[PDB]
Design a protein around this ligand. Structure first.
Ligand code: 331
Ligand code: B7G
Length: 260
């Protein structure tokens, strides 16, 4: 009945996910278990840069160059998240303006959620798996660039402890985007209703895919809550970069998200 009709709904979201995201956690963990060129310093960064692994703003500095790469990566993940969102029927039913409102306020949360998929205790994949940047190298970046990405690792390791597969993620992400709590959201009841359908689908999907997993569901709800905080602290550091990092330019689409 309920538990039957939702299976469908869940598989459909999983297909949108497989169809749209550049990198699946399956593909990610694989590469991270088994190779990618390791970037742990300037030498290897310049190396990776040239041809080793790899249209950015004019060079300016090491730490900033990385910041720019982060931007390029984020912009690309925002494009996927958008396509993924549109691949969910109920999401497209919404007026174009509300769709943009959900993406505007939910993508970073989604992005940091998925970041966990390509991240292990020591670093993270880059360039479609082609390379691996060390966590220690990021930490060495001149501040404030060295602070921004570190909290994400902390988040990611705990998150990865839940051992979620791509099918769980598709639903988890969907839940994040379809959140009726977003500012200026127009058809709040509609969004809320879709979110609920997603959460119920998620739970049923979890007791199936993770039989013996104790408190998985409510734990995921807390993670959503955490991502909300993670993004908030991220936005704060971002305002500090816009204030003090006068020379560092910001991608237009990213400024639109961070303006209000
Ligand atoms: C050696 C090259 C190093 C490359 C490092 C790239 C690290 N980085 C960006 C994290 C980040 C950093 C800053 C960030 O801040 C900005 C301002 C900039 C994008 C934003 O909030 O939009 C947002 C997000 C990622 O790998 N991101 C990433 C990739 C796939 C995915 F599914 C989810 C992800 F978060
Ligand atoms: C590509 C989908 C994700 C887009 C995220 C960025 C959206 O920015 C917002 O665009 C709205 C509609 O145009 C406004 O009117 C704003 O004021 C604004 O900041």
């Amino acid at each position: 009945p309920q538990v039957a009709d939702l299976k469908a709904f869940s598989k459909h979201i999983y297909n949108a996910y497989l169809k749209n995201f550049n990198m699946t956690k399956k593909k990610a963990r694989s590469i991270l278990t088994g190779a990618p060129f390791v970037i742990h310093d300037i030498e290897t960064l310049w190396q990776a840069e040239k041809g080793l692994v790899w249209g950015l703003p004019p060079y300016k500095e090491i730490s900033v160059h990385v910041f720019y790469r982060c931007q390029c990566t984020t912009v690309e993940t925002v494009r996927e998240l958008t396509e993924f969102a549109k691949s969910i029927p109920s999401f497209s039913s919404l007026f174009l303006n509300d769709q943009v409102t959900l993406l505007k306020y939910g993508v970073h949360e989604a992005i940091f959620a998925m970041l966990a998929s390509i991240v292990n205790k020591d670093g993270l994949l880059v360039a479609n798996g082609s390379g691996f940047v060390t966590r220690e190298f990021l930490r060495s970046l001149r501040k404030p660039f060295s602070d921004i990405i570190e909290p994400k690792f902390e988040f990611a390791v705990k998150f990865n402890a839940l051992e979620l597969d791509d099918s769980d993620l598709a639903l988890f992400i969907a839940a994040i985007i379809l959140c009726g709590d977003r500012p200026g959201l127009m058809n709040v009841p509609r969004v809320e209703a879709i979110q609920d359908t997603i959460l119920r689908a998620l739970e049923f999907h979890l007791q199936a895919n993770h039989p013996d997993a104790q408190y998985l569901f409510p734990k995921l709800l807390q993670k959503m809550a955490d991502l909300r905080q993670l993004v908030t602290e991220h936005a704060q550091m971002m305002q500090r970069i816009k204030k003090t990092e006068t020379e560092t330019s910001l991608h237009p689409l990213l400024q639109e998200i961070y303006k209000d």
